[PDB]
Amino acid sequence: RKDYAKLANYDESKVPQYTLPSVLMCHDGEMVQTKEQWEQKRRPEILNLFTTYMFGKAPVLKHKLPCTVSRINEKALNGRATRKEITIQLTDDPQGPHIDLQLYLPNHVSGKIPVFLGISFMPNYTIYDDPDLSVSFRGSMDKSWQLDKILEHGYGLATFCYNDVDPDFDDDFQNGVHPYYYEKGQNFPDPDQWGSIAAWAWGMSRAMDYLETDKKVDAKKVAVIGHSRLGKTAVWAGASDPRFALVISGNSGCCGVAISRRCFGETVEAMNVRFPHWFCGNYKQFNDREKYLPFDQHELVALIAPRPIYIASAEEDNWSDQKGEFLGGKGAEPVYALYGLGGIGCEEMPPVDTPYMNGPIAYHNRKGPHAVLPYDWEQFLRFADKYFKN
Amino acid sequence: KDYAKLANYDESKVPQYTLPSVLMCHDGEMVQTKEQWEQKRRPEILNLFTTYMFGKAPVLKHKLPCTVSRINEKALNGRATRKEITIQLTDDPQGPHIDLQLYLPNHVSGKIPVFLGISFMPNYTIYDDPDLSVSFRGSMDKSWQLDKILEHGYGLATFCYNDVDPDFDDDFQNGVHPYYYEKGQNFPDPDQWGSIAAWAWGMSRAMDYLETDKKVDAKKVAVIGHSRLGKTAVWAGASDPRFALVISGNSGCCGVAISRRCFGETVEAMNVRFPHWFCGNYKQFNDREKYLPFDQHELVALIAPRPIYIASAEEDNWSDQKGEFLGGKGAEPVYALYGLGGIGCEEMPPVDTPYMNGPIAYHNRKGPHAVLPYDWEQFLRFADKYFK
Ligand SMILES: O=C(O)[C@H]1O[C@@H](O)[C@H](O)[C@@H](O)[C@H]1O
C-alpha cells in the first residue's frame, strides 16, 4: 500500500529525456498541414486512442434521458438570480441514480445567457451560502465557485455533485451507473469501457443535454470547468463533447494536461494504483511504461482546438507538475495554428501570478495551494469575456 | 523488484476466486450445444486472448516461400529421412527465415504423424546426427527422445525460436516484428503480437510447409513446447485448429495454470521480467487477475474437441502444478458439449499417476522443470490413442 508522494521526483534536472508522440503525424505516416486532414483523419484517430486506452467508451444514447425541473425560484438571491433544480434520470430505473443539477441564472439580463457547467466534490448546498437551502455546510465551497463574480459578468453557473453519477471509491463498479449499462453476461466494464472519470464526463454531457433545452441558456456558450480529478473530467468532457464552447482545467495535472513522459510528481502508476476506478482497464498497462503511451496529454488539449482552454496551475502543487501542465498546452499549439490561432504567448513557463490569456490556450501558475481560489475565477471570467461578449 | 520472495507456495493461502464462466456469452446466452460454442462463444473467447493477452499476428492472403535445402533418406544409418526446409517469414528472402529440421521414420506404411516442436537451441542439439556440425550436438536429445518418436512410427519437426524473434526485450527492433509495421510505426500496437504470439505464428508457418509434404499426415501434427515454448505451443494449438494434439510441457503461468490462484509465478512477475512475451494490453492485468475477462481454462477450451496433454513436475512449484491440472479441469464443460469425458478424477492426482483416458491428459511427474524421457513415454502413449 505504497505512499507514492515520497518516491516521486520533483527535481527538474532529473526529468528523463523523452520524445512526445507527433500530434500532426497519422498512424500511417501521413502528416497534417490542413485543418481538413485534422478534422477528417487525425483528430478521430487521437479521439479513438484516448477513448480505447485511457478514459474508456461511455454508453451512447438514442434519445436524451428523462429529466424534470423539480423546483424553480425566480427571486433566489434577493431577486439577483433564478435558481432551478433539474433531476436527470441516468438509467431506465426511476429509483436509480439521478443528476441533481442546480442552475443559477442572473435576473435583469435580456439575451440567452452563457453558463459555466461545473462538477463539484460536494452537494449543491456547498456552492453558495443560499438562505433558501438546508443541510460540509452551506456555501462552504463558495471560494471555489465565486457565484457573485459569475453573476456580475451576466453568466450563469450550473453544477452537480459527481457522486450523483458514480461514487468516488473503488467498489469494482457495482454502484453508480456502470452496472445499469452492463450486458446480461458482464459483471464488470470491459478493458476499453468507461471508468469513473469517463462516467463523470458523460454526466456533464447529460447536464448539457438539459441546458440546450433551457430557453434562457445560450447552448453555444457553455464552459465546462472542474478542479483536480474533476479537472481531468472537465478536459475529457471538452475533448469528447464538442458542444462545450470553452474548457477550464483547474490543476488537472497527471492524466489531465500534464505530460506523462516527464514522470514528475504524480505518475500513471501512482494514479492507477491509488484510483483503480478512475480510468479504463486498458490504461493500467502504462503503469511505469510512460514511454509506451500511444499518446501524451498535449494530444488531449489538441482535441479542444479550435475552442479555447484555460490551464491553471498552483505554485505549491508540484504533485500536479505545473511545468508539464504548461507543456501539455505548448504541445497543442501546432493544431491551433491549423486554424490560424496563436499559442499561449510565451516559449518557457511563466513566473507565478503572470497570466497569459491573449491566445486560444490561456495559462497561469498562481501562488498558494492546490485549489480553485477567487484569483483563478478572476482570470477565468476575463478569458470567458473575450469569447462570450464583444 | 524480486518476485521470488513474493511467491505463495502455501495451498491453504490461495485466495478466493470465481473462474469466469466459459459457457456464458458476453450478452448472457448460456452455451449448451457445440453449435452455439462454434458459432458464438469460441469466436468471443479467441478474440479476448488475441486482443488482451497474446496480441494479433499478421493474417496472410497466401503462404510464404519454403525451400527444401537438403534431404537425406538414409539418415541415422537408414532408420529415418532428415529434411532441411528453409521458411521465409516475409516477402524478402534475405529477411528472417525458419531453419525447419524434420525427421521421418523410414519404411512405415502410410503418411506419418509429426510432433511439431519449437526448441530453445539450434536443431543440431536435438540429436547426435553426424551429418550435422557446430550448446553442442545432442545436448537437448534428453528433452526430444527422437529414438522413441521414430520407434512409434512418428517423426519430429523442430525450429529454434530465435529464428522468428529473439528472446530479449529489444523493443521488437530485431526479428519478424519490424517487417510488418506500417509507415509511422516503431512498435506493435497494444493489441498486436509480442514474442509468444510471433513464436506461435512461427509454428503456423512450419505447418504451412508440413501439410504440403507427401509423407506427412497433415491431419496428425501435434504441437509440443516446454516452459515459455509450452505457453507458445498452447496458443499455436488454440489460434490454429489444423494441429491435432497439443502438448503443454510445464507451461505454467499464462499457459494452462489458473491465473487467479496467484500461486508461484504471477502475471506481474511475468510481464515485468519478460515485457516482450505478451502484448501491451496484457500488462494491464499485473496484480489484477480478479479482472481478467478470461482465465487459462478458457485457453485450454479453445483446443476442444482436439486432445491436449498437461505435464507438471513435482519440484516446479513456480509453475503452480495444481493450477495446471485445474486449467484442464475447467475445460471439461466444453469437451462435454462434444459428448467427451474429462480428465477422470476430481482431486489432483498423486505424483507419477498419469490420467490420459479422456481428451484432456494430466500427469505430475517426479523431479525438475524439464521435459524428461518419462514425459515422452506418456506423450506417445497418448498420441497412440488418436494417431493409430
Ligand atoms: O524456466 C524458465 O526460464 C522460465 O519458465 C517459464 O515457464 C516461466 O514462465 C519463466 O518465469 C521462467 O521460469
Residue numbers in the entry:
A (entry chain A): 26 to 160, 172 to 426
B (entry chain B): 27 to 160, 172 to 425
Can I see the authors' text?
Glucuronoyl esterases from carbohydrate esterase family 15 (CE15) have been proposed as an aid in reducing this recalcitrance by cleaving ester bonds found between lignin and glucuronoxylan. Only PvCE15 proved amenable to crystallization, and its structure was solved both as an apo protein and in complex with GlcA and GalA, respectively. PvCE15 has an α-/β-hydrolase fold like previously determined CE15 structures, consisting of a three-layer sandwich with a solvent-exposed cleft comprising the active site. The catalytic triad (Asp353-His406-Ser264) and oxyanion-stabilizing arginine (Arg265, oxyanion hole), whose positions and roles have been established in previous work on CE15 GEs, are conserved in PvCE15.
A complex structure with GalA was obtained by soaking with neutralized GalA, which revealed a binding pose distinct from the GlcA-binding pose, where the pyranose ring is flipped, resulting in the anomeric hydroxyl pointing into the cleft and positioned where the GlcA O4 is found. Distinctly, the carboxylate of the uronate is positioned out of the presumed catalytic center, with the C6 far from the catalytic serine (3.9 Å), but it is still positioned by the oxyanion-stabilizing arginine (Arg265) through one of its Nη atoms. A water molecule is found occupying the presumed catalytic center and is 3.2 Å away from the C6 of the uronate, which could suggest a water-mediated mechanism for this substrate. This orientation for GalA has also been observed with OtCE15A from Opitutus terrae, which has a similar preference for MeGlcA and MeGalA substrates, possibly suggesting a water-mediated mechanism for GalA substrates that is distinct from the mechanism utilized for GlcA substrates. However, the complexes obtained are only of the products of the reactions which may bind in a different orientation than required for catalysis. The complex structure of PvCE15 with GalA is found in a binding pose distinct from that of GlcA, where the carboxylate is positioned out of the catalytic center and could suggest a water-mediated mechanism for this substrate distinct from the serine adduct previously observed with OtCE15A and proposed for other CE15 members with GlcA substrates. The analogous pose was also observed in OtCE15A using a catalytically crippled variant, where the catalytic serine was replaced with alanine (S267A), and the difference in GalA versus GlcA positioning was speculated to be an artifact of residue substitution or the presence of DMSO solvent molecules present. However, this new observation of GalA also with the wild type PvCE15 reinforces the proposal of a distinct water-mediated mechanism for this substrate, especially for CE15 members with similar activity on GalA and GlcA esters. To investigate this, we obtained crystal structures of PvCE15 in complexes with both ligands.
